[PDB]
Amino acid sequence: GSSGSSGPTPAPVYDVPNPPFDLELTDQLDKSVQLSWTPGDDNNSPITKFIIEYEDAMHKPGLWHHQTEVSGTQTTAQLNLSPYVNYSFRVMAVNSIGKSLPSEASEQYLTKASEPDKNPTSGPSSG
């Protein structure tokens, strides 16, 4: 990482819009779930857009793809889910600076299948 010190100058400092938190999943339509995220600090540079991504845990866990984005004003976007599909949802913030890192990682939303129980394959993840 960089390393400096001293330097009198009334200059600001940015670093893309920090990642969101408290990520949650709530809906009430039918075939369209809404992803509620909370954009933390903007770091001088205000949010302009919010990209999202997900990873097919039911297929290839760790493969994030392009889901959808929105304006830097809203904080709720609809996600298209399918039956027998597991994956996470990561929100991203993009401003004049650039695109920040993806949100931590919301809960594992598993659609309805031919069997109850959230995740079919449980395991000691993160211990």
Coordinates of N, CA and C in Angstrom, one line a residue:
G1 N 0.8 -1.2 0.0 CA 0.0 0.0 0.0 C 0.9 1.3 0.0
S2 N 0.2 2.4 -0.4 CA 0.9 3.6 -0.4 C 1.4 4.0 1.0
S3 N 2.2 5.1 1.1 CA 2.7 5.6 2.3 C 3.2 7.0 2.2
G4 N 2.6 7.9 2.9 CA 3.0 9.3 2.8 C 2.7 10.0 4.1
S5 N 3.0 11.3 4.2 CA 2.8 12.1 5.4 C 3.1 13.6 5.1
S6 N 2.5 14.4 5.9 CA 2.6 15.8 5.7 C 2.1 16.3 4.4
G7 N 1.9 17.6 4.2 CA 1.4 18.1 3.0 C 0.2 19.0 3.2
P8 N 0.4 20.3 3.4 CA -0.7 21.2 3.7 C -1.5 21.5 2.4
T9 N -2.7 21.2 2.4 CA -3.6 21.4 1.2 C -5.0 21.0 1.5
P10 N -5.9 22.0 1.3 CA -7.3 21.7 1.6 C -8.0 20.9 0.4
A11 N -7.5 19.7 0.3 CA -8.0 18.7 -0.7 C -8.7 17.6 0.0
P12 N -9.9 17.2 -0.6 CA -10.7 16.1 -0.1 C -10.1 14.8 -0.4
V13 N -10.8 13.7 -0.1 CA -10.4 12.4 -0.3 C -11.6 11.5 -0.6
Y14 N -11.4 10.7 -1.6 CA -12.5 9.8 -2.0 C -12.0 8.3 -2.0
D15 N -12.8 7.4 -2.6 CA -12.5 6.0 -2.6 C -13.7 5.2 -2.8
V16 N -14.4 5.6 -3.9 CA -15.6 4.9 -4.3 C -16.6 4.8 -3.1
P17 N -17.9 4.5 -3.3 CA -18.9 4.5 -2.3 C -18.7 3.1 -1.5
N18 N -18.5 3.3 -0.2 CA -18.4 2.1 0.7 C -19.5 1.1 0.3
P19 N -19.2 -0.2 0.7 CA -20.2 -1.2 0.5 C -21.4 -1.1 1.4
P20 N -22.5 -1.6 1.0 CA -23.8 -1.6 1.7 C -23.7 -2.7 2.9
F21 N -24.7 -2.6 3.7 CA -24.8 -3.5 4.8 C -26.3 -3.8 5.2
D22 N -26.4 -4.6 6.2 CA -27.8 -5.0 6.7 C -28.6 -5.6 5.5
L23 N -27.9 -6.0 4.5 CA -28.5 -6.6 3.3 C -29.6 -7.5 3.8
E24 N -30.8 -7.4 3.2 CA -31.9 -8.2 3.5 C -32.7 -8.6 2.2
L25 N -33.7 -9.5 2.4 CA -34.5 -9.9 1.3 C -35.9 -10.0 1.7
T26 N -36.7 -9.0 1.1 CA -38.1 -8.9 1.4 C -38.9 -8.5 0.2
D27 N -40.0 -9.2 0.0 CA -40.9 -9.0 -1.1 C -42.3 -9.2 -0.7
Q28 N -43.2 -9.1 -1.7 CA -44.6 -9.3 -1.5 C -45.4 -9.0 -2.8
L29 N -44.9 -9.5 -3.9 CA -45.5 -9.4 -5.2 C -46.0 -10.8 -5.7
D30 N -45.1 -11.6 -6.1 CA -45.4 -12.9 -6.6 C -44.2 -13.6 -7.2
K31 N -43.8 -13.0 -8.4 CA -42.6 -13.5 -9.1 C -41.6 -12.4 -9.3
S32 N -41.2 -11.8 -8.1 CA -40.3 -10.8 -8.2 C -39.9 -10.3 -6.7
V33 N -38.8 -10.7 -6.2 CA -38.3 -10.4 -4.9 C -37.6 -9.1 -4.9
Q34 N -37.7 -8.3 -3.9 CA -37.0 -7.0 -3.8 C -35.8 -7.1 -2.8
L35 N -34.7 -6.6 -3.3 CA -33.5 -6.6 -2.5 C -33.2 -5.2 -1.9
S36 N -33.3 -5.2 -0.5 CA -33.1 -4.0 0.2 C -31.7 -3.9 0.7
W37 N -31.0 -2.8 0.3 CA -29.6 -2.6 0.7 C -29.5 -1.2 1.3
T38 N -28.4 -1.0 2.0 CA -28.2 0.3 2.6 C -26.8 0.8 2.3
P39 N -26.7 1.9 1.4 CA -25.5 2.4 1.0 C -24.8 3.2 2.2
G40 N -23.7 2.7 2.7 CA -23.0 3.4 3.7 C -22.4 4.7 3.3
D41 N -21.2 5.0 3.7 CA -20.5 6.2 3.3 C -20.3 6.3 1.8
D42 N -20.2 7.5 1.3 CA -20.1 7.7 -0.1 C -18.6 8.2 -0.4
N43 N -18.0 8.6 0.7 CA -16.6 9.0 0.6 C -16.5 10.2 -0.4
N44 N -17.1 11.3 0.1 CA -17.1 12.6 -0.7 C -18.0 12.3 -2.0
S45 N -17.6 11.4 -2.8 CA -18.3 11.1 -4.0 C -19.6 10.3 -3.7
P46 N -20.7 11.0 -4.0 CA -22.0 10.4 -3.8 C -22.3 9.2 -4.7
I47 N -23.2 8.3 -4.3 CA -23.6 7.2 -5.1 C -24.4 7.7 -6.3
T48 N -24.1 7.0 -7.5 CA -24.8 7.4 -8.7 C -25.6 6.2 -9.2
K49 N -25.0 5.0 -9.0 CA -25.6 3.8 -9.5 C -25.4 2.7 -8.5
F50 N -26.2 1.6 -8.6 CA -26.0 0.5 -7.7 C -26.1 -0.8 -8.4
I51 N -25.0 -1.5 -8.7 CA -25.0 -2.7 -9.4 C -25.2 -3.9 -8.4
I52 N -25.7 -5.0 -8.9 CA -25.9 -6.2 -8.1 C -25.3 -7.4 -8.8
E53 N -25.1 -8.5 -8.0 CA -24.5 -9.7 -8.5 C -24.9 -10.9 -7.6
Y54 N -24.9 -12.1 -8.2 CA -25.2 -13.3 -7.5 C -24.3 -14.4 -7.9
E55 N -24.2 -15.4 -7.1 CA -23.4 -16.6 -7.4 C -24.3 -17.9 -7.2
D56 N -24.3 -18.7 -8.3 CA -25.0 -19.9 -8.3 C -24.4 -20.9 -7.4
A57 N -24.8 -21.0 -6.1 CA -24.3 -21.9 -5.1 C -24.8 -23.3 -5.4
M58 N -25.9 -23.3 -6.1 CA -26.5 -24.6 -6.4 C -25.9 -25.3 -7.6
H59 N -25.0 -24.5 -8.2 CA -24.2 -24.9 -9.4 C -22.8 -24.7 -9.2
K60 N -22.4 -23.4 -9.2 CA -21.0 -23.1 -9.0 C -20.9 -21.9 -8.0
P61 N -20.6 -22.3 -6.7 CA -20.5 -21.3 -5.6 C -19.2 -20.5 -5.7
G62 N -19.3 -19.2 -6.0 CA -18.1 -18.4 -6.1 C -18.1 -17.7 -7.5
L63 N -19.1 -18.0 -8.3 CA -19.2 -17.4 -9.6 C -20.2 -16.3 -9.6
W64 N -19.8 -15.1 -9.4 CA -20.7 -14.0 -9.4 C -20.9 -13.5 -10.9
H65 N -22.1 -13.2 -11.2 CA -22.5 -12.8 -12.5 C -23.2 -11.4 -12.4
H66 N -23.4 -10.8 -13.6 CA -24.1 -9.5 -13.7 C -25.6 -9.8 -13.5
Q67 N -26.2 -9.2 -12.4 CA -27.6 -9.3 -12.2 C -28.3 -8.1 -12.7
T68 N -28.2 -7.0 -12.0 CA -28.9 -5.8 -12.4 C -28.4 -4.6 -11.6
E69 N -28.7 -3.4 -12.1 CA -28.3 -2.2 -11.4 C -29.4 -1.2 -11.4
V70 N -29.2 -0.2 -10.6 CA -30.2 0.9 -10.5 C -29.5 2.2 -10.3
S71 N -30.4 3.2 -10.0 CA -29.9 4.6 -9.8 C -29.2 4.7 -8.4
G72 N -28.6 5.8 -8.2 CA -27.9 6.1 -6.9 C -28.9 6.8 -6.0
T73 N -30.2 6.6 -6.2 CA -31.2 7.3 -5.4 C -32.0 6.2 -4.7
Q74 N -32.3 5.1 -5.5 CA -33.1 4.0 -4.9 C -32.2 3.1 -4.1
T75 N -32.9 2.2 -3.4 CA -32.2 1.2 -2.6 C -32.9 -0.1 -2.6
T76 N -33.9 -0.2 -3.5 CA -34.6 -1.4 -3.6 C -34.8 -1.8 -5.1
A77 N -34.3 -3.0 -5.4 CA -34.4 -3.5 -6.8 C -35.0 -4.9 -6.8
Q78 N -35.7 -5.2 -7.8 CA -36.4 -6.5 -7.9 C -35.4 -7.6 -8.5
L79 N -35.4 -8.7 -7.9 CA -34.5 -9.8 -8.4 C -35.4 -11.0 -9.0
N80 N -34.9 -11.5 -10.1 CA -35.6 -12.6 -10.7 C -35.0 -13.9 -10.3
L81 N -35.8 -14.6 -9.5 CA -35.4 -15.9 -9.0 C -36.1 -17.0 -9.7
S82 N -35.6 -18.2 -9.6 CA -36.2 -19.4 -10.3 C -36.3 -20.5 -9.3
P83 N -37.1 -21.6 -9.6 CA -37.3 -22.7 -8.8 C -36.1 -23.6 -8.8
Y84 N -35.7 -24.2 -7.7 CA -34.6 -25.1 -7.6 C -33.3 -24.4 -8.0
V85 N -33.1 -23.2 -7.3 CA -31.9 -22.4 -7.6 C -31.4 -21.8 -6.3
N86 N -30.2 -21.9 -5.9 CA -29.6 -21.3 -4.7 C -28.5 -20.4 -5.1
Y87 N -28.4 -19.3 -4.4 CA -27.3 -18.3 -4.6 C -27.5 -17.1 -3.6
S88 N -26.4 -16.3 -3.7 CA -26.4 -15.1 -2.8 C -26.7 -13.8 -3.6
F89 N -26.6 -12.7 -3.0 CA -26.8 -11.4 -3.6 C -25.9 -10.4 -3.1
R90 N -25.1 -9.8 -4.0 CA -24.2 -8.8 -3.6 C -24.5 -7.4 -4.3
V91 N -24.5 -6.4 -3.5 CA -24.8 -5.1 -4.0 C -23.6 -4.3 -4.1
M92 N -23.5 -3.4 -5.2 CA -22.3 -2.6 -5.4 C -22.7 -1.2 -5.6
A93 N -21.8 -0.3 -5.2 CA -22.0 1.2 -5.4 C -21.0 1.8 -6.3
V94 N -21.5 2.6 -7.3 CA -20.7 3.2 -8.2 C -20.9 4.7 -8.3
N95 N -19.9 5.5 -8.2 CA -20.0 6.9 -8.2 C -19.0 7.5 -9.2
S96 N -18.8 8.8 -9.1 CA -17.9 9.5 -10.0 C -16.5 8.8 -10.0
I97 N -16.1 8.4 -8.8 CA -14.8 7.7 -8.6 C -14.8 6.4 -9.4
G98 N -15.5 5.4 -8.8 CA -15.6 4.1 -9.5 C -16.6 3.2 -8.8
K99 N -16.4 1.9 -9.0 CA -17.3 0.9 -8.4 C -16.6 0.3 -7.2
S100 N -17.3 0.3 -6.1 CA -16.7 -0.2 -4.8 C -16.9 -1.7 -4.8
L101 N -16.4 -2.3 -3.7 CA -16.4 -3.8 -3.6 C -17.9 -4.2 -3.4
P102 N -18.1 -5.5 -3.6 CA -19.5 -6.1 -3.5 C -19.8 -6.2 -2.0
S103 N -21.1 -6.0 -1.7 CA -21.6 -6.1 -0.3 C -21.1 -7.5 0.3
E104 N -21.0 -7.5 1.6 CA -20.6 -8.7 2.3 C -21.1 -9.9 1.6
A105 N -22.4 -10.2 1.9 CA -23.1 -11.3 1.3 C -24.3 -11.6 2.1
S106 N -25.5 -11.3 1.5 CA -26.8 -11.5 2.2 C -27.0 -13.0 2.4
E107 N -28.0 -13.3 3.1 CA -28.4 -14.7 3.4 C -28.5 -15.5 2.1
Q108 N -28.6 -16.8 2.3 CA -28.7 -17.7 1.2 C -30.2 -18.0 0.9
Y109 N -30.7 -17.2 -0.1 CA -32.1 -17.3 -0.5 C -32.2 -18.5 -1.4
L110 N -33.0 -19.5 -1.0 CA -33.3 -20.7 -1.7 C -34.8 -20.7 -2.1
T111 N -35.1 -20.8 -3.4 CA -36.4 -20.8 -3.8 C -37.1 -22.1 -3.4
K112 N -38.4 -22.2 -3.8 CA -39.1 -23.4 -3.4 C -38.7 -24.6 -4.4
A113 N -38.7 -25.8 -3.8 CA -38.3 -26.9 -4.6 C -39.2 -28.1 -4.1
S114 N -38.7 -29.3 -4.5 CA -39.4 -30.5 -4.2 C -39.0 -31.0 -2.8
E115 N -38.9 -30.1 -1.9 CA -38.4 -30.4 -0.5 C -38.3 -29.2 0.3
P116 N -38.7 -29.3 1.6 CA -38.7 -28.2 2.5 C -37.2 -27.9 3.0
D117 N -37.1 -27.1 4.1 CA -35.8 -26.8 4.6 C -35.1 -25.8 3.7
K118 N -34.6 -24.8 4.3 CA -33.9 -23.7 3.6 C -33.0 -24.4 2.6
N119 N -31.7 -24.6 3.1 CA -30.7 -25.2 2.2 C -30.8 -26.7 2.4
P120 N -30.7 -27.4 1.2 CA -30.8 -28.9 1.2 C -29.5 -29.5 1.7
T121 N -28.4 -28.8 1.4 CA -27.1 -29.3 1.8 C -26.4 -28.3 2.8
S122 N -26.6 -28.7 4.1 CA -26.1 -27.9 5.2 C -24.6 -28.3 5.4
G123 N -23.9 -27.3 6.0 CA -22.5 -27.5 6.3 C -22.0 -26.4 7.2
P124 N -20.9 -26.7 8.0 CA -20.3 -25.8 8.9 C -19.5 -24.7 8.1
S125 N -20.2 -23.8 7.5 CA -19.6 -22.7 6.8 C -19.2 -21.5 7.7
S126 N -18.0 -21.1 7.6 CA -17.5 -20.0 8.4 C -17.5 -20.4 9.9
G127 N -16.4 -21.0 10.3 CA -16.4 -21.4 11.7 C -14.9 -21.2 12.2

